[PDB]
Structure formats: structure tokens, C-alpha cells
Design a protein around this ligand. Sequence first.
Ligand SMILES: Nc1ncnc2c1ncn2[C@@H]1O[C@H](COP(=O)(O)OP(=O)(O)O)[C@@H](O)[C@H]1O
Ligand SMILES: Nc1ncnc2c1ncn2[C@@H]1O[C@H](COP(=O)(O)OP(=O)(O)O)[C@@H](O)[C@H]1O
Ligand SMILES: [Mg+2]
Ligand SMILES: [Mg+2]
Lengths: 313, 313
Amino acid sequence: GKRVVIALGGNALQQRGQKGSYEEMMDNVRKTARQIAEIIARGYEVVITHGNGPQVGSLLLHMDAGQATYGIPAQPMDVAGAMSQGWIGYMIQQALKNELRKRGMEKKVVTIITQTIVDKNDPAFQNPTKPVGPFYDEETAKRLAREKGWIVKEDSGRGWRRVVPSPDPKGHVEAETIKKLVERGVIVIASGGGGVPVILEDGEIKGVEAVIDKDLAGEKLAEEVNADIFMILTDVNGAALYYGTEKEQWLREVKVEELRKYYEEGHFKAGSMGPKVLAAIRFIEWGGERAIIAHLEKAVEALEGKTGTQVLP
Amino acid sequence: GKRVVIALGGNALQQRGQKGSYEEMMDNVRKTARQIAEIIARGYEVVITHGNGPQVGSLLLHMDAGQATYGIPAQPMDVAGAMSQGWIGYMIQQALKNELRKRGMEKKVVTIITQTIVDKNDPAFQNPTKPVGPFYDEETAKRLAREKGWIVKEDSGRGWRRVVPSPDPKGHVEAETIKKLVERGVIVIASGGGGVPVILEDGEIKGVEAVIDKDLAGEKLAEEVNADIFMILTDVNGAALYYGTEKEQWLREVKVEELRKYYEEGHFKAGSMGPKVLAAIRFIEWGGERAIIAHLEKAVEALEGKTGTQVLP
Ligand SMILES: Nc1ncnc2c1ncn2[C@@H]1O[C@H](COP(=O)(O)OP(=O)(O)O)[C@@H](O)[C@H]1O
Ligand SMILES: Nc1ncnc2c1ncn2[C@@H]1O[C@H](COP(=O)(O)OP(=O)(O)O)[C@@H](O)[C@H]1O
Ligand SMILES: [Mg+2]
Ligand SMILES: [Mg+2]
């Protein structure tokens, strides 16, 4: 069967308005796992990645409160991303191996903790723009800046929050092992959250506090495993021109040259759809057969080419 | 080369007195990685596990403070164990691959998120007695007992705590994939903290809230990967008879028949050295060639048979 990387998004774990309690996440993950299980029953070789923004944000909230109440040290963002990969990957590997056993299918399903390499001279480290963590007042946010070297900015009028770098993913430290597992039929969950951001210097891989886009990092995983198809599943069913306006037009089959023109026109917003269109464009430019942007609830119909945005060479 | 499962303990990550800051843990994991890289330079096939008691403890304190301050949901103990495997695995896989890379050894090092199967009829579930989490007052602890189904007890005069089961590990969900990676020469970190505790019910894997002893779970990982040697690294250089008294004798080479008799005499305290000697006894009874209990800082000499307790058939 064809090999597909499926990059899950927020809605695989949390619905609009949910705080992300354990029971909420267990229900959303089981719904996700039935869609993936359908795709595995159809014969596809599946590799899974996902986001972690709300989950790393909850861990940063928790550790700021722990440090204030019990005096125990808060851990840095690379550690919070590794914690998130163990959390989310445990819930997806247990629900997907259980839904495949319910279908009379025995498969091996594992999470591999993944480090994503970026260039230490990436220009994003000179200009951090992604807001993250708790909302602080001005006084606490500027004291944290002085003491820790953080950058802060007032965020949409809700308080002050750290801003961190969003560097471009170059590749994964564990790519060789990830591909070996895929080639032997294991369903691997990797690059969770975009992976832990790391740079290489003086022999050592070292964590850095940043966010890597999970669709851009997912596209690099798709190159690394030699995937045929790269599919992004989100909470809208594709990419639209003139989104939210009276001229709104949902893209269906679109050639990559046309999608690149649409991209420079600005239709795909930078905090959201822009990087998913960029990742689909890059996968086609690398040589992939098809990239897809669709809604999680239409994963299977999308994968067959019937709905969603379908990007071709 | 001989295949060895190395079961690290507290001192691989924290020393006496430390709270467990990132910088403390990064320094202790670097020291651990220099020991293991020398073993790998010597041609052994290594598999690594470790404990997670202080690190799941910190996460339970952080999430009770987070839910109390920000109203975000705390997650249950199986999820906190998964978070701990991601956090500790990422640090050891980064440090160990860095020491191998600087010494001119290119080796793959990865953490697999591991679930440890226990028997749902284990008598431990009828008698929980390991205290975990924050110290509460009696009202708060008995309200949580009513609302959540917890068992609480007053712990050593410091307040009331939840008590959980400590079931015997039977095997690991991921054992076949772990062993296939070891046979391909990947250095695997697995069963961290004893693994996420899970039962099997009607074919479905379900998490439970419990602690699984990391040395007993380490010995079952050694059975599953067909290890030759099982080596526990701790903060004392072996097991002693009549520990702390005038009759004290530190065991060097010991045969399993004698060591079972000493175990029955009660020399090895149940919350510390007892499970280490039980796990060494079990590895020799399963058919292993040698089980070792030694100090972390003397790991190479101990694997060579020159120091520490050396348990033989
Ligand atoms: N041109 C566009 N077409 C479609 N959706 C768009 C567009 N521009 C912005 N969006 C937003 O992109 C959002 C999906 O991205 P995002 O919220 O980051 O989700 P995920 O967690 O799946 O990555 C949609 O809910 C939509 O509101
Ligand atoms: N018979 C004994 N021989 C040696 N050490 C013992 C014995 N009984 C108890 N101990 C204690 O076991 C401790 C090591 O176990 P533990 O503290 O649980 O460490 P780890 O984190 O490595 O599992 C030693 O520091 C020692 O105080
Ligand atoms: Mg997004
Ligand atoms: Mg111990």
C-alpha cells in the first residue's frame, strides 16, 4: 500500500471549549484512532505525527504553579516538549493498538521520543515571535526577562507572555531508526509537537526553548521515511481563498504552481493555515505524489482523493 | 558481545539533597552517559532502564498546584508516568549519543514509550501501601477519597497521602519491537520508571494508577530481550548481609541458592535493596549468566566482574 504520514492537529485531542481533562482527551483520541484504524484496514503504511500546543501550555502553567507553591524547579521548554511526546504518544499508541485489536488486527504501535535539528544561525533566533506560557502582569513578565533572558511582549491585551523562536526544521536526530521501524511494518508516532528543538555544537546536541511547526516538521519526517502521501488533518476541510469573506472559495484539486501563487497572495494566515500550505507545497517540490489538507472527520474520504484540498505536481 | 540490561537508579539523575533542576539533572545524566559509553566502547550490546520516583513525584506536585491555581486539569498517574519516560528518556538519549559521537562512535540511541502489563487479580490491588503525591490535611485527603475512589493514609506524621498498589510486572506491551531494535544494534531506553502500569481486559490495554518496581520490571525486560547479564547500578557497591551492624558483610561473588536464603532471612530492606536482590535472583533462575548489583561510578569494573555483588548460577 502507499505510505502516508498523517499530521494530526489540535482537534485530534481537544474540542473547542474543552480544558483537556483526561476524560476529554481519552474520548477524542479514541475517535481519532478509529479513523486511523480504518486507513490501516485499507492497506496503507501509516506514520503518525501531531501537535502539542495546548499540552505544552498546560505543562508550563502547571510547573509555574508548582514552583510557586512547593518550591520545586520548573523545567524548560525542551523538557516540556519531551513530556508532551510521552503523554500524547502513550494515549495514541494504546488507543490505536486497542482499536486495531478490536478489528481483529494485531499491529505494533510505538512512540519514539524525537529531537528536531535546527540551524543555530536560523534568523528566527534573532526575532522570536511565537507567544507561549502563562499570561503574566507587566512586572512579573519583565522580571522573568531580566532573570532568565526571556523576551516578552503584551499579547493581544490579555497580559504579558514570553515569545519564543519558531526556527525551520532541518531533520530529526532519530530519523534512521524511525525509518527502520516503518519499513518493518511498525506504526510509529514521532516528531510529536514538531519534536524537541535542538542544535548541534561542539559534538553535542543541545535543547533550545522554541516552537517548531508540527506540519513543517511532519513534512520533513515524510521525506525521511520516503512517504508517498503527506496528509494534514485539521478542523476545516482544506485551504480556502478569501477565507471568512463573501468570496470564500474552498480549494479542491490544485496544482502546486497554482497553490504557490495563492500562497504569495496571502490567503493562508500565518498563525494557522499558512504553514500547512507551505508544508504541502514543500512535499510536492521534494517529489511526493500528493499532499492533502482536510478535516479529521473526513480523513478516509480525503485520503481516497474525494474531499478536501488535494495538492498535486 | 554480551547483551546487558542496565537498570539505573536515583543517582543517575539526582544526588543527595538536590531538587532536580534541569542543570542538576543534565550534569548527573552526563556523568551516567560517560559510564555507559565506555561499556559500549567495550563491545557490549546495551539496553537501558531507570527509575522515576522523584520525577513522577514532582509532576504530581506540579499538577496539583496547577489545578489549584489556574483551574486546569491534573492528569492521572499512568499519564504522569508517560510524561516522565519522555522527560528522562530524552535527556539520557541526548547525553549518551553525544558521548558516543564525540568518541567517534556513531550509534543510534532512542526511547520507546513502554507499557508494563500486570495482572488485574494481583493481590497488590487489594492492599495499596505506597504513598505518593502531595501531603494533604485529613479533610482534603478524605474528600478526595470520597470523590475519586482513592485510598489515603497518614504518612509518617507529615500529613495524609494517597497510597497506591505496587503490582508485580509480568511483561511489556512493546517487548517485540524493543528486542527487534536491540538486534539491529540500537541502544534502547525502555520501561522507564517501571513502565506505564496497564492491565489487559477483554483484549483492551487499560492504564491503572500504581507504581511498578523498576528493577523487577528491568529483569522482565532482560528476559524479553534475551540478555546475558542484568546489572543494577545504585549508590552503594552491592548488597550486604547484616547491613549497618557489626556483623556486616558485603557480598562479592554469591551463588543464587545462597542469595535466595539470605533474601529469606530479611537482610535486604523491602523499600530499597530487597527488590534489587529479588530481581537478581529471578534473572538467574530464568537462566541468565550473571546478575550484578554495584555502584554507578564503578559500572565498568562491575560489568567486568571485578567489584560489587556478582550473582551466579
Ligand atoms: N485560508 C484559510 N483557509 C482555511 N482555514 C484557514 C485559512 N486561513 C486561516 N485558517 C484557519 O486555519 C485554522 C486551522 O489551523 P490551526 O488552528 O492551527 O489548527 P491545527 O491545530 O489543526 O494546526 C482553521 O480553523 C481556520 O480558522
Ligand atoms: N542489605 C542492604 N545492603 C545494601 N544496601 C542496603 C541494604 N538494605 C538497604 N540498603 C539501602 O539500599 C539503598 C539503595 O536503594 P535505593 O535507595 O532504593 O536506590 P535506587 O535509587 O538506586 O533504587 C542504599 O543506599 C542502602 O542505604
Ligand atoms: Mg496549528
Ligand atoms: Mg529504589
